[PDB]
Short mmCIF file of C-alpha atoms in Angstrom, two decimals:
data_model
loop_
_atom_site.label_atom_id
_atom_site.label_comp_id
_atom_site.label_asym_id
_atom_site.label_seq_id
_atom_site.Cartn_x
_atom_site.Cartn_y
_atom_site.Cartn_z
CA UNK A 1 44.94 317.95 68.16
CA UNK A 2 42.07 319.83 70.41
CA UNK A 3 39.58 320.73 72.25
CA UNK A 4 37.44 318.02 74.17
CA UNK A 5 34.59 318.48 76.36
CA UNK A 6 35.56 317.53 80.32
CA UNK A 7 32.50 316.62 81.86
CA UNK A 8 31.74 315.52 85.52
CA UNK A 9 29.42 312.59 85.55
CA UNK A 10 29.93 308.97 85.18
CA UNK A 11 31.82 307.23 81.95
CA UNK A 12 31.17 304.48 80.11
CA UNK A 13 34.12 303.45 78.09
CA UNK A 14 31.82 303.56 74.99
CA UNK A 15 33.88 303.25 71.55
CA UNK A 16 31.40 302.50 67.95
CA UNK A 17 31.60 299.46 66.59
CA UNK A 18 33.30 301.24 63.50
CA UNK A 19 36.55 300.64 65.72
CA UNK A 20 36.35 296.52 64.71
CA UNK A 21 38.54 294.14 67.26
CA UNK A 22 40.67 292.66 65.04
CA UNK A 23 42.06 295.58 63.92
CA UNK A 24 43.72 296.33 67.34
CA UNK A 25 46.97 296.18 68.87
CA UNK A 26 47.06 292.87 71.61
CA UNK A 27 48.60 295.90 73.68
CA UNK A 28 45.05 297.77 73.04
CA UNK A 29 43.06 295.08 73.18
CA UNK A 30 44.29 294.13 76.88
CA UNK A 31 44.08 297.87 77.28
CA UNK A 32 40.33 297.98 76.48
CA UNK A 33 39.23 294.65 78.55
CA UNK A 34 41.27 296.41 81.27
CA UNK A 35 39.19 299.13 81.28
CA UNK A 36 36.00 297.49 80.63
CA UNK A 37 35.05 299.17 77.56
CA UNK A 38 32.41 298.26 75.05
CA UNK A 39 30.93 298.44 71.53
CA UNK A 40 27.98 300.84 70.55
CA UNK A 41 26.43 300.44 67.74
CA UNK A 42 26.43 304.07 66.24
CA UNK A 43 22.94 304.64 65.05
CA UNK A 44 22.02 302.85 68.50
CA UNK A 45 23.83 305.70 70.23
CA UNK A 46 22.64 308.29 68.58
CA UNK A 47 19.16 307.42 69.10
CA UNK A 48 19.38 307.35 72.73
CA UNK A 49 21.53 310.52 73.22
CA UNK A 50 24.25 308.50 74.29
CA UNK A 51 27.94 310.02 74.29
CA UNK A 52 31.18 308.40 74.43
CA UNK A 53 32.22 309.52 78.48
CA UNK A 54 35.49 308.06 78.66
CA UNK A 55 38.06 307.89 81.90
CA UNK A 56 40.67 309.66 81.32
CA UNK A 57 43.39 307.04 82.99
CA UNK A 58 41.42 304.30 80.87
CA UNK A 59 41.93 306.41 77.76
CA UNK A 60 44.95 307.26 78.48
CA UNK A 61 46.18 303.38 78.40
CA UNK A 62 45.71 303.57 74.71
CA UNK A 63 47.75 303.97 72.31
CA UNK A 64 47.52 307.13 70.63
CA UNK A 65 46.38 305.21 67.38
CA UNK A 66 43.48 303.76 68.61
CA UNK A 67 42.63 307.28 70.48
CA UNK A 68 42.75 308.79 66.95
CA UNK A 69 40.66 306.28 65.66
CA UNK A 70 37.72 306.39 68.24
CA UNK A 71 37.46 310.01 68.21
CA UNK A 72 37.19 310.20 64.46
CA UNK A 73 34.76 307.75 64.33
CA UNK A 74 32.56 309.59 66.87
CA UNK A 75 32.94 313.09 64.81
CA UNK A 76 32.15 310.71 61.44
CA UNK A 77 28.86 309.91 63.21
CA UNK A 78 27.78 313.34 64.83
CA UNK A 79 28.30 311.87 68.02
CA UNK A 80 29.85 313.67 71.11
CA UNK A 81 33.23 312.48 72.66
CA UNK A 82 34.08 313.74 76.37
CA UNK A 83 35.74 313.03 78.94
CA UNK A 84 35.95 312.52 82.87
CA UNK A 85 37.93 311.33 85.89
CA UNK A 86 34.55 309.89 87.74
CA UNK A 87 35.24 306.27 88.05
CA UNK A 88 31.85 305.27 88.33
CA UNK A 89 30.11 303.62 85.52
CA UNK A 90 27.00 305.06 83.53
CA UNK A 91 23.79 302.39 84.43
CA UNK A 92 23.81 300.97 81.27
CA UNK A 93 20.01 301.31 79.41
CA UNK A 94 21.16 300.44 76.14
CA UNK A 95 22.44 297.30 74.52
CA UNK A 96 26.34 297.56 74.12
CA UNK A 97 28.68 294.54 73.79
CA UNK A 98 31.55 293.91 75.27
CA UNK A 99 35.16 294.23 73.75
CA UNK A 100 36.88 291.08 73.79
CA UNK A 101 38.36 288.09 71.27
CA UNK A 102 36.32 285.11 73.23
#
């Protein structure tokens, strides 16, 4: 694979909404509620300067499927992808929704 940009700030678990629910693994699904992560829509995010700051345990409990898959949807859209062992959670300014079956 490659290069990814390792930031220091806080993540937000962001993934586009490209990366639809229902086409997930129940093992990524619990994965992603585990972690807290949520949908962005990708013109929303791009916008607002937004970039996908992910956790590198939390992205790390994904399979390597859906880690493909959110990465390529984030180059797909000109958006940045980086990541980051802060635990703390970006103060959310934007609407995002949050990943789930309900």
């Amino acid at each position: 694979a490659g290069d990814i940009e390792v930031t220091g700030d806080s993540c937000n678990n962001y993934m586009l909404t490209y990366n639809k629910v229902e086409n997930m693994t129940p093992r990524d699904l619990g994965a992603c509620i585990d972690c807290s992560a949520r949908h962005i829509n990708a013109q929303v995010a791009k916008s607002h300067n937004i970039a996908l700051i992910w956790n590198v345990k939390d992205f790390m409990s994904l399979s390597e499927q859906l880690r493909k898959q959110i990465r390529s949807a984030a180059k797909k859209n000109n958006l940045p992808f980086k990541l980051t062992c802060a635990t703390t959670r970006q103060v959310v300014n934007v609407v995002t929704t949050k990943i789930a079956l309900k």
